Amino acid sequence: VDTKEFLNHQVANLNVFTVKIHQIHWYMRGHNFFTLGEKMDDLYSEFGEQMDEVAERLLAIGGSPFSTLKEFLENASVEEAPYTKPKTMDQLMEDLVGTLELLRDEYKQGIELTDKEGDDVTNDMLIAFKASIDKHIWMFKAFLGKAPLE
Amino acid sequence: VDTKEFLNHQVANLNVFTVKIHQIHWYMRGHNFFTLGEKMDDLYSEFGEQMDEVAERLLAIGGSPFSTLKEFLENASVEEAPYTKPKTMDQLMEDLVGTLELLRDEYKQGIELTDKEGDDVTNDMLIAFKASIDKHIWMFKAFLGKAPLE
Amino acid sequence: VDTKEFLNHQVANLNVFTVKIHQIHWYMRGHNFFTLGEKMDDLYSEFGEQMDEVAERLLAIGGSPFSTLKEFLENASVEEAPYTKPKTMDQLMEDLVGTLELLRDEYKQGIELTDKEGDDVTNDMLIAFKASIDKHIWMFKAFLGKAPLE
Amino acid sequence: VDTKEFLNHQVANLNVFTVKIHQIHWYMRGHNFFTLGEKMDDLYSEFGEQMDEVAERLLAIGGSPFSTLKEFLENASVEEAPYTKPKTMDQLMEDLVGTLELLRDEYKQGIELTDKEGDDVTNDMLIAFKASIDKHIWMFKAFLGKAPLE
Amino acid sequence: VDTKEFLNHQVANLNVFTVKIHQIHWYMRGHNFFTLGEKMDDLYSEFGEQMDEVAERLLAIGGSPFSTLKEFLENASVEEAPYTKPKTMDQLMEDLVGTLELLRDEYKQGIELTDKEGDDVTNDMLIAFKASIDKHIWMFKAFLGKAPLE
Amino acid sequence: VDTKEFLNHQVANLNVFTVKIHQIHWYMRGHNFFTLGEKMDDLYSEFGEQMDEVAERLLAIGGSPFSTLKEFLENASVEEAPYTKPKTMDQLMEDLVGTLELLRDEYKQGIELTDKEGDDVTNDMLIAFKASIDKHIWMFKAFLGKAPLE
Amino acid sequence: VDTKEFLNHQVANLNVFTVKIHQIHWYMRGHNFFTLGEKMDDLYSEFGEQMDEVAERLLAIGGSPFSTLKEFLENASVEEAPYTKPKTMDQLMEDLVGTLELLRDEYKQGIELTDKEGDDVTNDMLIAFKASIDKHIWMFKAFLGKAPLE
Amino acid sequence: VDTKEFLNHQVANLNVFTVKIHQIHWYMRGHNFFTLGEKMDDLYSEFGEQMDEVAERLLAIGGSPFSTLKEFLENASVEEAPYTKPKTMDQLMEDLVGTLELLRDEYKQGIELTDKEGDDVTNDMLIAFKASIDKHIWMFKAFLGKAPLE
Amino acid sequence: VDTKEFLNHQVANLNVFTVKIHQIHWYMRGHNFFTLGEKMDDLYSEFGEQMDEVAERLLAIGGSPFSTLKEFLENASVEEAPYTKPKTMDQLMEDLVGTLELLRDEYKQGIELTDKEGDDVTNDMLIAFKASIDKHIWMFKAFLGKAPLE
Amino acid sequence: VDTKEFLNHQVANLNVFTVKIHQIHWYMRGHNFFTLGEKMDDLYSEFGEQMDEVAERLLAIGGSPFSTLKEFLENASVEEAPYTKPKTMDQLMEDLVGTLELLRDEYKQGIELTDKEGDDVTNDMLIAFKASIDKHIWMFKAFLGKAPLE
Amino acid sequence: VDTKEFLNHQVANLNVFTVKIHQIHWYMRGHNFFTLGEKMDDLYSEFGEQMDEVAERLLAIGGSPFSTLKEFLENASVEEAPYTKPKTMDQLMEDLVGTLELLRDEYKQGIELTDKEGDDVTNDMLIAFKASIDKHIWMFKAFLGKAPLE
Amino acid sequence: VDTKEFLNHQVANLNVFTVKIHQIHWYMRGHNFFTLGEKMDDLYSEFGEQMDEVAERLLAIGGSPFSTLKEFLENASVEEAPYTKPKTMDQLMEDLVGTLELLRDEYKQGIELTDKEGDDVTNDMLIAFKASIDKHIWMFKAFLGKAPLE
């Protein structure tokens, strides 16, 4: 793709992801409601901050970020669904994990692309984000009784 | 509309508005960039917390929060548009203020509803949010040379 | 009941509830001991804070707060029992919830009585507390796997 | 006399009360000098914050706050007098308490008036102020060896 | 006796003391209202933490803490009475100092017992509270114009 | 005028100035509403503290500070006027600067006078106040597009 | 054994325990991953401070602390095994708990030895550590659904 | 004298004053025990820092500070006496005030001497300490029911 | 031409740039004085920090940083000139943005150079600084009414 | 070697280094006792943190950290030796510097290996650790009277 | 002797020591001036807390503290000498170590005295102080290159 | 030379001195690397503040500060030389002391000139700076084994 198009795509993804995290926090039940609820507050903030960093970096290389729900929905590859059928804590975490893995695999594409375009700053930004995602993956997989790449 | 429906309606509104605040921040230019930039981060957080409290209050009365972009679009009275043709710092603050006014008047309806249904907590919450909106309306109107209600 | 009596009745209830929260903390066992332990410490502080405000509000409208364990036992509707034969972490939490639901329903009576008697301050006080009690019933019921209003 | 004129009247009162808090602080003698001097500091700040929130609230409903000593003098119901004759600390705390009594009764009038006008925010602001005043009235009455309403 | 019984006996005493500290706070009147009320707040926190630590130590050695108002009244040697007739500040302080004296002396008894049973931790815990108590006795008797042990 | 008369005179001035700072905060409009609003909050509290220090120093030399709005008005050389026509942000800043220059020039008189009377503490205090005033003059003249002394 | 060799034996014990706490943190899985993860960070820090204090007290009486993995291994009574077979959260905490039990019983012997030698400072340091170990034992055992001394 | 001997003379005085502040704090009795206790801690700290500053200034200008109790006693104009007969708070507070007046009056001599000799740093340091001493004379005189100078 | 040469060149540049940030703070006039003035304080610290990190990195790889104004002047590519002719706020910020662009482009060279010599640490330090520079180029261009890559 | 075995090898090395830092601190003597003690506290904490991140990163890529003293000693290239004979400050710090140099050199191989395997995140973690190591070698060598590569 | 006289005796010792720590600070010269003057500032404060605690414990047991320089000189075994002949940093430190050693050995006597009197609180305090004294003896002897007990 | 030219001359000096403090920090070797390194940090920010205060004061009396390297070099009396051949810590500290002595002597000319011109603010600021310089001169002179004035 190009670097601008990549970052914008992640602007949309991250605004979908952030609303999903609220969905999980609002609808979760079970013995881990307090501990996992506060984990989702923290996740909400961090993913809000990555989103800002992506948008502001795109601004800084001369692009124009998506800035409506309509545009996020039209461009996100991260998926959402309304909450209807009760979902277990394990199933919410599995959804969360699925999304983190999706962002991990797309950032890895952004990392390669951005090395080929010689955009050293955006490259480095995306790698620091992947470092945090990879650590979240291990922890939530561990919560689900699984190994990180299982 | 009953109390549950009012509140969910505001959950959607606030998510549209929050994303709007980011639009104003991302795309603002001119001599006031720095000082309205900081004010927009402040508004982003304040309305983010408002949206959280509205959702948790709805949860606490037996209701089910809207929790996806598509649901927020389907139900929001707050309007958004993509940023296409440049806009002045004044033009952006006027959309901001125009959206604040919308929320003020709709919170006023929620306050009356909620008082007739005898829901004293939701009533109190809505008032304190209004006190803040009234103050922001006075301040951003002063920024544009105008009296609050004028 | 007049406002002074209603306020004094809650001084009693809250000094009983306060001791009950320590009972739960001290005796609780099972996989949720740490997170529920910290949550009991927060509830303890918070409800002793309420109690203090209740008594101070009673003092300021010219009343005389109960001020002995015996007076609290004589006047409370919140019940206690000594801990004898083990109960599980669901059983202690259901007892907790039951008591929050009693303080909510009684606070609602106090709200109405206080409105009728034109005491705006005590009214506002009580409503603010019910906001917090309502939040706690939602949260603690989500922990138990159930909806807020059961 | 409507909400705007009531708020404006309190701007004048609170500026007179504030300067009377300095007069007491400056002229006090006796064994309680240090602990009541510190009390007057806290009261000076607290009452300077009410004044600000009152003037900001009047601005937010479209009014114009009095903004000169001359204007506070033409309009205040709170009385002041030059410090010609030394007084005991008890007599100074009687004058203090008599002014808090005046402000409580006046805010009561504004509370009823602002409920009749459906100004929910100004109403709620004034109740919160009345709660703090009633607490100070209990305390300074206790300092003087009397009950709150006496 | 034995150590566990002695600790439980103090769980009951400290809960009664703590309610008595509140009693003195709520009802005191006279020139020392502010400083002494402040001090009662400090004593209230300090003795409540003393009580948790007594209860947790009891838990740590296989005990079962008293955990009701009923059980505290049945086992406490600390005496409580309802407030009816007005009391001086001095008279309230003489009650406070006499209760502090009674806990000191039961603690010395407890320190000797726990020495003989070889419970080093519980012995150390009790020596440290007697340090604080002894300090409070000197300080409050000084407030009353008296030596610490006259 | 001797040292005590001079200090008393500035107690009156500073109470007038402090109210003028509020008038400027409350009635200000235009693009610098936010940044200038915070500057008057800082000025308000700085000049309140100058006033407290002037008064306490008048006390410490055997003086008796003016302590009513009536005395402040009767003795102050600083002028006030009711807010009747809306003013420019520039015009309001010219009234601020104009008042700062008056205080600067008068303090210069107090500094010579107090040097002549050999009162070294009052001399020192007044010189530290002048330093801060001279800096406020540069900065606000700079804000107005001007050099400090033209 | 004299005091020196005892304290040195705990330098080695503590170095093995501390690496064991890391083993538990790194390999834990299941629903208590998040709550116990943070608990192991706290236990890691607390037991690393115990060891510093043990070594410094050994240095202050003229001893010479073990200072290699090799010597810690040759002298520790605490045992380690490499992680191979998967283990439950429950098995890991039982290892943790058994190991705390070992430390408690060895310190009880150091408290006797150290009293017989007349070394009052080391005795006191050892009693404080035992206090904290015993509290930890009650707590982790309660997480496991058992009483402290079972 | 000269500047070096003057500073050394005050090093001695301040060490005699600071032990007196402890004496007043240790022997004080009566209703003001708690509040005056706290002011004695603050004066001790403040007068201790003033001493270090005087001694380090003495060093900066090439002098050699008195550094023993024997030299302090041999050089100080400040008097001390052992505490034998009982003394009231007032009597304790009047020795405190008499001592500040002496330090004030000697600092005044040192100020004049330091002006003649051209030591502008020492001159300014002495003036700042007299500002605080003057303020303390005002406050403790006022605690005694007296004007600062008469 | 090698890593050491480049890093030293930037030590020279950053010391010229820093003094230019001061020239801008000291001479700026107009309505943005307060907000741009604070912005220069922050840039001043942040480029001083960068300079130290460049100096420390040169030192870490065996170099000898320039350490005199004479050396900075002879070696710098950033330009300076005495402030003589009046400059507009915009004109000063264009000079800033211009100097920022020069550093961005030079850092780009150092990034490719340090890639080819295999100095990964210096490479990564340079990438991090350019990220911050690119963002300030965006923000200041936006203050000027302009796209970042204009 | 792959990434996983490199990282595990450093888990081993970092647990040996950390214990050697303690050896240095505990056996420090001379004029440098306080300055070097402090610096060793800081280095212990830093290398402790470094270790956790190495372990956690290995966990995140599907590996299995060494987790016993036994495996650390079996796998480590960093050497240790018992303190059987007194050594100088200089010998202890030369050891420190040489161990730092080995870690730099091996991390340099890991940076090359992770680059070749396309592990962007690990590569970047390792480069930031080298930045700090290179800076500690400069500083600790400057302390010994030598240039960084001498 | 008895506990009261042993405590007074140390009130005199600590007062002599505190002044002595100041002498070391003030007259100290050479390469260790900064690294050791900071440690003298800590030792000053620390032995100031100790002296307070001794004095207040004496008061709490019915004693009457020495409270004049004269009384401290009459009663102390810690010796002081005026500074005339210059001294090595070595010499001043040796006199420091020698004085801490005296204090250690007199506290050892107080500990025994206080065990045989049954004063459990005073005993514990004296042990806590000797702990810190032992540490200081070791650290300062390490700084001089001696082992703690040669 | 007048007050303006003196102040501008010190803007030049302070910029050379601040860069000399960096030269000292960067090239220092030996046993005080860490402790003096940190003193150079404190000094760097302290004379940086002095410079800002001198420039802002010059601004506030209608002056125009030098604001380029070329101007500072042309005007300064403080000397600098490039770091070529190696220098001891003492030699570095003598260069530092010699420069502080120069500033002290020049500031004393500015103290006199500024007294003759009736500029009280600038006079007081310069005395405060001399007070700090004199303190530094004693401490660094003592480091070197010398008396302040020799």
From Swiss-Prot, chains A, B, C, D, E, F, G, H, I, J, K, L:
One Pfam family in the UniProt entry: Ferritin
Entries under CDD domains matching the protein: DPS
Gene Ontology BP, a term: intracellular iron ion homeostasis
First-listed, main subcellular location of the protein, grouped into a coarse class: cytoplasm
EC code: 1.16.-.-
Positions that bind Fe cation 2: 56
Enzyme class label: oxidoreductase
Triggers of expression: By iron limitation and stationary growth phase.
Key words, A-Z: Cytoplasm, Iron, Iron storage, Metal-binding, Oxidoreductase
Catalytic activity annotation: 2 Fe(2+) + H2O2 + 2 H(+) = 2 Fe(3+) + 2 H2O
One MF annotation (Gene Ontology) recorded for this entry: ferric iron binding
Record-listed Fe cation 1 binding positions: 25, 52, 56
Subcellular location: Cytoplasm
Gene Ontology CC: cytoplasm
Highest rank taxon of the organism: Bacteria
Subunit note: Homododecamer. The 12 subunits form a hollow sphere into which the mineral iron core of up to 500 Fe(3+) can be deposited.
Function: Protects DNA from oxidative damage by sequestering intracellular Fe(2+) ion and storing it in the form of Fe(3+) oxyhydroxide mineral. One hydrogen peroxide oxidizes two Fe(2+) ions, which prevents hydroxyl radical production by the Fenton reaction. Does not bind DNA.
Domain text: 12 di-nuclear ferroxidase centers are located at the interfaces between subunits related by 2-fold symmetry axes.
Family statement: Belongs to the Dps family.
This protein's name: DNA protection during starvation protein
Species: Listeria innocua serovar 6a (strain ATCC BAA-680 / CLIP 11262)
Gene that this polypeptide is encoded by: dps
